[PDB]
Amino acid sequence: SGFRKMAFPSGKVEGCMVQVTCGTTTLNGLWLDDVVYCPRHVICTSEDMLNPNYEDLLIRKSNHNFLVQAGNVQLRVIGHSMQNCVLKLKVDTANPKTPKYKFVRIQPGQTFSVLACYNGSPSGVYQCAMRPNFTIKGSFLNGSCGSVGFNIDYDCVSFCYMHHMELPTGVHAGTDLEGNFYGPFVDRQTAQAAGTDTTITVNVLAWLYAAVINGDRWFLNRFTTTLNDFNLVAMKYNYEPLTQDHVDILGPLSAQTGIAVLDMCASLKELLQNGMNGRTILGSALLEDEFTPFDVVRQCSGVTF
């Protein structure tokens, strides 16, 4: 028993991290087979970040302007192109430690592990949710650009995020591995605001189930509710509406505990209306929304990779 914010083992992604330098700008790249993927803003100077013309910037660079280092070994660049916000550097050596992988775009509410890196080397690993407003609440400093987020599904690494920037509010924004930003953001130092964030209701339910599985039961009550009545309440508190799809995804946890989803919803309703009321759940005094139902199944069933 016990329930922790738990990240995927990072070794398969660690062996893909390299350093990419262009001019005096250094960040991280991801080396899969004979290509290094990194954020395109590596090619900017500060004379460019007002209103960068990336195509034009890239035209002026040659292969020899890109220094890629894999530990001590320099990897020679033999081609460059840009796919949306990601620079693809072809190199003269394919990475022998390339895992089985795919590129996926995650949806709001879903979670992934981030391997935070500086200078092509790993700093630490932690779990993040894609927020409903398409930001993440990570831990990144200058030079972390190109750090990636990922899930491991069976034997396969699913890369879903590359870090590009911090917003003025202190939250973080980035792209999928095909270079498309999550949300309404661009890779420019311009004033950029996110939508208003919302609480990921399905995940809060997941976490309440986790709590029951691990013996925290005080918030349970005899009441049950309807999807409509639940949503009337929850939406006042800036919670995402719960849909039938979400109820279905909670099935394994309702099965495990024998607490119907609409029964747990009446617990959540009471928690919203009366607060945590001086108690804790799984070591927290707030309702936690960054575990998905799949995260709970994974951790409580001991899935391996």
Partner: peptide, 4 residues
């Protein structure tokens, strides 16, 4: 200098 937030483009990381």
């Amino acid at each position: 200098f937030x483009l990381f």
